[PDB]
């Protein structure tokens with residue numbers, strides 16, 4: 001039933017706010033929190049993401065966190081900014097200056113207890129909490145460092161609940177901040193141990209989509225986030241509307257995660273339209289939100305979500321056609337590893353769309369790219385004093401790198417595995 | 421023959437009771453073993469998490485005792 | 488007396504339950520409020536339909552049924568739907584959180600919190616029976632609740648009601664409508680743990696029903712509603728002998744004597760005819776010979792497998808409607824001279840026949856034509872083991888890598904339970920092979 005949503009740091013709060021805008025529109029909830037829709041399908045699972053307050057007001061089950069106050073001002077002035085509960089805004093004064101150790105060990109530790117007080121109050125009134133989703137980036141200090149701290153503290157208090165992240169991976173094409181690969185490696189080390197499911201939203205891929213495919217010569221954060229919000233709407237459709245498949249976070253995890261560490265998903269979306277075309281495009285490298293070629297690895301598991309009025313016969317036939325013509329890319333030792341849902345309600349401004357969630361061994365390409373950037377700096381111990389000055393040892397960097405290299409080797413092991 | 425008749429019906433009673441008994445004890449053994457295993461899984465997870473909180477304290481001290 | 492208690496477990500069990508009870512109401516003239524104007528004994532009776540319905544002093548006819556699910560949304564539809572007045576609220580039991588497609592959660596972590604309540608409610612039904620015959624248990628193989636909670640319940644029922652019979656209707660997974668990758672695990676775990684607790688189990692392969700709906704009903708993409716209406720007709724055929732009188736009616740127990748030669752070999756193949764649309768049934772009456780001959784067409788079976796490449800240990804024909812023995816015997820004689828019906832050398836080859844005269848009924852807005860006569864064949868064939876082979880292979884592929892096993896281990900299961908279950912299935916496949924070998 002209930003999901004508790006947490007958004008941390010600049011990126012987390014910006015993509016977080018857009019998520020709430022896009023889904024509030026799909027459920028017919030206006031900025032005051034009043035329902036003004038046309039269909040009972042909008043309200044039937046509304047409690048997954050919204051609390052009901054007095055006056056038939058719907059209030060996002062959403063907590064807003066940053067070490068920088070002012071991201072709080074910009075959210076609060078955003079189009080849906082009045083919908084959030086005022087006590088769910090938890091902000092420090094300091095900033096973290098793109099330093100994971102400040103987020104995780106010093107500045108973020110100071111603030112983490114007040115975030116947990118709000119988490120607990122939201123959790124306490126849930127009929128049957130399923131778990132948590134966190135939106136954050138891995139390249140800064142607050143979303144990365146403090147976000148992974150929150151995960152660890154939440155897990156101590158709710159060890160049997162599902163932990164889900166939408167984790168924005170850094171790219172030199174979008175931020176030139178040089179310590180991003182450190183902050184991302186340190187975060188990935190946390191995510192590997194403490195989340196059940198992570199959507200890898202790669203700024204490399206979002207940029208390449210805006211540039212190459214959508215022909216935007218100079219992509220802004222707004223253009224990247226338009227892709228993120230369509231993806232997030234898509235991958236939570238099964239949580240938010242009545243349906244058979246992957247209808248809660250645990251069932252999704254059980255379908256998607258064959259080994260506990262291999263829980264980093266490649267999302268895709270189409271269009272960026274006939275059923276054959278949606279289906280070809282959703283499996284195309286160019287439609288993936290992680291910059292990985294799926295033809296360079298194998299799929300462990302896949303969820304495909306089609307939205308809009310279309311023939312379910314045609315959807316079944318095309319899903320079968322892609323599997324048959326691309327059979328070498330699906331591991332033979334997990335039978336029937338591709339699941340398909342169709343929801344009648346399309347997203348805003350489209351008649352038809354498809355959202356893709358892949359657990360592919362090709363995701364190793366993302367981690368290797370981060371690993372390469374990490375090593376290029378770490379071999380000269382460049383910029384380390386920012387982290388050792390907050391109390392961290394070199395050993396912690398060595399371990400994080402080693403653990404991310406192990407994740408890569410593990411993805412490789414299952415790629416090479418055979419049935420016979 | 422009357423004594424054979426009595427042994428057949430007692431043998432049937434004995435086998436039915438024995439089936440019930442063995443199914444009752446098997447179930448109780450499984451549910452116990454499952455409870456202990458689940459609790460040991462959760463206790464190991466909590467223990468890794470407590471070790472992180474312990475390590476975070478060594479970090480704030482390293483930084484305090486740096487200055 | 489001779490009461491039968493139905494227990495519907497998880498989504499598949501529940502929704503099939505809805506279709507079955509709806510159909511039983513129509514067959515007996517019971518209204519959605521439970522009233523039955525034709526029943527002149529108010530508040531009780533020992534009529535044949537009382538095996539499945541109890542009666543209140545206010546004339547309500549109440550299914551002898553418990554519905555159980557670990558989340559509330561499917562059972563809430565029964566509580567608010569057309570037949571809501573049929574059921575006392577205590578017969579409809581729900582938790583807050585489901586088994587998440589994990590046998591271990593249904594059998595242990597979540598299932599344990601509700602098992603005493605469920606047995607309590609079943610007990611209330613049993614105490615109202617003056618000669619309880621046994622239980623009919625409806626569930627999926629693939630879901631966490633249908634697999635894991637059902638196993639737990641069957642084990643507890645053997646404890647609380649001893650050797651009292653327990654029959655299953657078990658939904659065997661198909662990829663066209665499956666919702667979890669781990670269904671083969673859940674199917675082997677439940678089959679293993681339930682095998683000693685069940686006297687007879689009717690497997691229904693979703694893929695066979697799905698194909699029959701597409702091929703014979705011209706349904707492009709069948710839903711659960713399409714599948715369940717057909718399933719309910721097959722169930723109704725099997726249970727018709729418990730719910731109606733007639734001089735040629737043969738009780739299910741008597742078919743069971745012939746269907747179960749050794750306790751583990753308790754899985755009959757059901758084949759049903761005719762499944763025909765209204766547009767094709769019009770001005771085309773199917774005769775006893777035609778419907779009977781359709782029972783030997785593999786395409787009409789409830790489980791995909793090929794009886795022409797195994798051996799029979801029994802064949803039972805359950806007719807309903809306008810059918811007299813003379814036409815049955817002439818149809819059987821014709822079929823024996825034309826078809827691949829090879830029995831094992833230790834069983835007699837006579838077909839056992841029952842006829843109930845009450846004709847088949849259909850539900851309004853349904854896909855099936857109303858027909859004057861229908862038949863369900865129940866055969867004990869070695870070929871049904873193919874269904875076990877397909878499932879066992881899928882299990883092996885995943886289990887050799889331990890894929891998804893950590894989800895079960897995290898709920899307190901051990902790997903030893905997996906391989907114990909798998910070896911019991913290997914021995915079952917082997918049993919089915921040994922019974923078809925000639926006597927030396």
Ligand SMILES: Nc1nc2c(ncn2[C@@H]2O[C@H](COP(=O)(O)OP(=O)(O)OP(=O)(O)O)[C@@H](O)[C@H]2O)c(=O)[nH]1
Pocket residue numbers: 008009010011012014015067068095096097098099137138139140141142143144168169170171174175180203206221222224225228
């Ligand atoms: N896709 C996307 N990326 C963003 C957005 N805002 C920031 N980023 C990325 O996030 C990373 C920087 O992290 P921020 O979220 O800005 O940092 P923070 O979590 O607020 O931490 P501090 O500012 O260090 O306290 C870089 O890789 C940015 O490109 C956004 O709105 N969309």
Ligand SMILES: Nc1nc2c(ncn2[C@@H]2O[C@H](COP(=O)(O)OP(=O)(O)OP(=O)(O)O)[C@@H](O)[C@H]2O)c(=O)[nH]1
Pocket residue numbers: 496497498499500502503556557558585586587588589593626627628629630631632633634658659660661664665666670693711712714715718
């Ligand atoms: N014929 C038929 N099969 C169904 C129906 N509902 C689900 N199934 C099948 O049953 C299996 C899934 O198990 P369910 O019964 O939905 O799950 P559950 O017993 O509720 O278990 P959890 O939801 O995991 O607690 C799949 O093979 C589905 O195709 C139905 O109404 N009819």
Ligand SMILES: [Ca+2]
Pocket residue numbers: 526527528529530531532542
């Ligand atoms: Ca009566």
Ligand SMILES: [Mg+2]
Pocket residue numbers: 009010068096140142
């Ligand atoms: Mg910031």
Ligand SMILES: [Mg+2]
Pocket residue numbers: 497498558585586630632
């Ligand atoms: Mg269910």
